[PDB]
Design a protein around this motif. Sequence first.
Motif, short mmCIF file in Angstrom:
data_model
loop_
_atom_site.label_atom_id
_atom_site.label_comp_id
_atom_site.label_asym_id
_atom_site.label_seq_id
_atom_site.Cartn_x
_atom_site.Cartn_y
_atom_site.Cartn_z
N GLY A 81 39.81 0.79 60.78
CA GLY A 81 39.41 1.31 62.07
C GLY A 81 40.51 1.40 63.14
O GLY A 81 40.33 2.10 64.14
N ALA A 82 41.64 0.73 62.97
CA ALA A 82 42.76 0.92 63.88
C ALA A 82 43.41 2.31 63.71
O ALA A 82 43.29 2.89 62.64
N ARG A 83 44.10 2.80 64.75
CA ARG A 83 44.60 4.15 64.77
C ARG A 83 46.01 4.28 65.33
O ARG A 83 46.44 3.50 66.18
N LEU A 84 46.73 5.27 64.82
CA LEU A 84 48.04 5.65 65.26
C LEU A 84 47.99 7.09 65.73
O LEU A 84 47.43 7.97 65.07
N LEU A 85 48.58 7.36 66.88
CA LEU A 85 48.82 8.69 67.39
C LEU A 85 50.33 8.87 67.42
O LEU A 85 51.02 8.02 67.93
N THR A 86 50.83 9.95 66.85
CA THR A 86 52.24 10.19 66.80
C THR A 86 52.55 11.61 67.29
O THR A 86 51.82 12.52 66.98
N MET A 87 53.63 11.72 68.04
CA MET A 87 54.00 12.98 68.67
C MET A 87 55.31 13.46 68.08
O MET A 87 56.26 12.72 67.89
N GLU A 88 55.39 14.78 67.87
CA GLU A 88 56.61 15.41 67.36
C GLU A 88 56.73 16.78 67.92
O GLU A 88 55.82 17.62 67.75
N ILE A 89 57.84 17.06 68.58
CA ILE A 89 58.07 18.32 69.28
C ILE A 89 58.46 19.47 68.36
O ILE A 89 58.19 20.63 68.70
N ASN A 90 59.04 19.18 67.20
CA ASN A 90 59.49 20.19 66.29
C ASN A 90 58.35 20.55 65.37
O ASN A 90 57.87 19.71 64.61
N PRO A 91 57.88 21.80 65.38
CA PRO A 91 56.67 22.12 64.62
C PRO A 91 56.83 21.99 63.10
O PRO A 91 55.92 21.56 62.39
N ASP A 92 58.01 22.31 62.58
CA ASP A 92 58.31 22.14 61.17
C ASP A 92 58.18 20.68 60.76
O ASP A 92 57.63 20.33 59.72
N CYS A 93 58.73 19.79 61.59
CA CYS A 93 58.68 18.34 61.30
C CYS A 93 57.25 17.82 61.50
O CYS A 93 56.80 16.94 60.73
N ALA A 94 56.50 18.33 62.45
CA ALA A 94 55.12 17.92 62.57
C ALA A 94 54.35 18.26 61.32
O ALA A 94 53.56 17.45 60.86
N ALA A 95 54.55 19.46 60.77
CA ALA A 95 53.86 19.83 59.51
C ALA A 95 54.32 18.96 58.34
O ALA A 95 53.49 18.59 57.53
N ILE A 96 55.61 18.62 58.25
CA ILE A 96 56.05 17.71 57.21
C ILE A 96 55.36 16.35 57.38
O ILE A 96 54.88 15.80 56.42
N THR A 97 55.32 15.84 58.59
CA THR A 97 54.70 14.54 58.85
C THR A 97 53.24 14.58 58.42
O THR A 97 52.76 13.63 57.79
N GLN A 98 52.53 15.62 58.76
CA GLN A 98 51.12 15.72 58.36
C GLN A 98 50.97 15.65 56.83
O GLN A 98 50.08 14.97 56.33
N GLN A 99 51.83 16.41 56.14
CA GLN A 99 51.75 16.45 54.71
C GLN A 99 52.16 15.13 54.09
O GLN A 99 51.63 14.76 53.03
N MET A 100 53.12 14.43 54.71
CA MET A 100 53.52 13.12 54.24
C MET A 100 52.37 12.09 54.34
O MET A 100 52.10 11.38 53.43
N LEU A 101 51.67 12.10 55.46
CA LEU A 101 50.52 11.25 55.68
C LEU A 101 49.38 11.58 54.70
O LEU A 101 48.75 10.67 54.18
N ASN A 102 49.16 12.87 54.44
CA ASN A 102 48.12 13.30 53.57
C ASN A 102 48.46 12.77 52.18
O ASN A 102 47.61 12.22 51.50
N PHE A 103 49.72 12.93 51.74
CA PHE A 103 50.07 12.47 50.42
C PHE A 103 49.85 10.92 50.32
O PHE A 103 49.42 10.40 49.30
N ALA A 104 50.20 10.20 51.38
CA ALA A 104 50.09 8.72 51.41
C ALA A 104 48.65 8.26 51.48
O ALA A 104 48.40 7.09 51.28
N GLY A 105 47.70 9.14 51.79
CA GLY A 105 46.33 8.79 51.96
C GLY A 105 46.01 8.13 53.28
O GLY A 105 45.00 7.50 53.39
N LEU A 106 46.86 8.35 54.28
CA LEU A 106 46.67 7.72 55.57
C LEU A 106 46.15 8.66 56.65
O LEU A 106 46.14 8.33 57.85
N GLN A 107 45.74 9.85 56.26
CA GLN A 107 45.45 10.91 57.22
C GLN A 107 44.27 10.55 58.13
O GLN A 107 44.17 11.06 59.24
#
Length: 213
Positions: A81-107
């Motif tokens: 139930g705890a949560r992390l909010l993360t900010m990234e200004i570079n849209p390419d890196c934001a998409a990589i971060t999303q996909q990294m989290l998805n792969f890790a199962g932390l989305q």
Amino acid sequence: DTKEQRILRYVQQNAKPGDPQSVLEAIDTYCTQKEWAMNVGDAKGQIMDAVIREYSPSLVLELGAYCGYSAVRMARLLQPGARLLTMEINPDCAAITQQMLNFAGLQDKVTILNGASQDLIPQLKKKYDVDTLDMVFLDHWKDRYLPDTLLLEKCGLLRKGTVLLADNVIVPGTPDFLAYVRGSSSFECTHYSSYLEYMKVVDGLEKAIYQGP
Ligand SMILES: C[C@H](C[C@H]1O[C@@H](n2cnc3c(N)ncnc32)[C@H](O)[C@@H]1O)NC(=O)c1cc(-c2ccc(F)cc2)cc(O)c1O
Ligand SMILES: [Cl-]
Ligand SMILES: [Cl-]
Ligand SMILES: [Mg+2]
């Protein structure tokens, strides 16, 4: 393709889906053996882990996600139930971060926001339903650590006990931020000496606990 894309592909091909620790290991291996990248790394990452376990924050804000290494690192240790909010200004890196989290199962634990911290911070209360933050990890442009700390306070996002944890206070360095928090009666500071990710170069984390006005 970019270095960041190569890192993501390496993780997808050398880690186990749903296994955050395997993701971190894969990234550390790639960055040691193939191409350096500005992830917080294993040395500093072990200190981060110790801080996250000490405080068990229910709501963390990260500034400067990059490829999601630190977001994986923190989110894997959060309580249910705890949560992390993360900010990234570079849209390419934001998409990589999303996909990294998805792969890790932390989305489900993490929201990755594509945008500049100085534009998004003032939206956290009305748009993202934030009251106050338990912890903030600062890892974005080094000259923004101080202005965004001050912005966080102005927006009413800090409470007594909020933990700021700042990467790179030695290399590349954040001298205005360090002078400020160390000299302010509103913070209690601790320096954790370590090494720059993947390098034999000294760096450190600063922990600055907000004490109120
Ligand atoms: C600043 C970057 C990290 C990310 O921050 C995002 N960003 C920016 N400004 C904003 C904003 N205002 N809001 C949101 N996101 C934001 C960006 O797009 C990067 O993806 N990090 C670094 O440059 C960094 C560099 C080094 C380093 C050390 C020795 C060297 F020889 C060379 C480089 C080490 C580190 O450990 C870093 O962390
Ligand atoms: Cl990182
Ligand atoms: Cl390392
Ligand atoms: Mg960093």
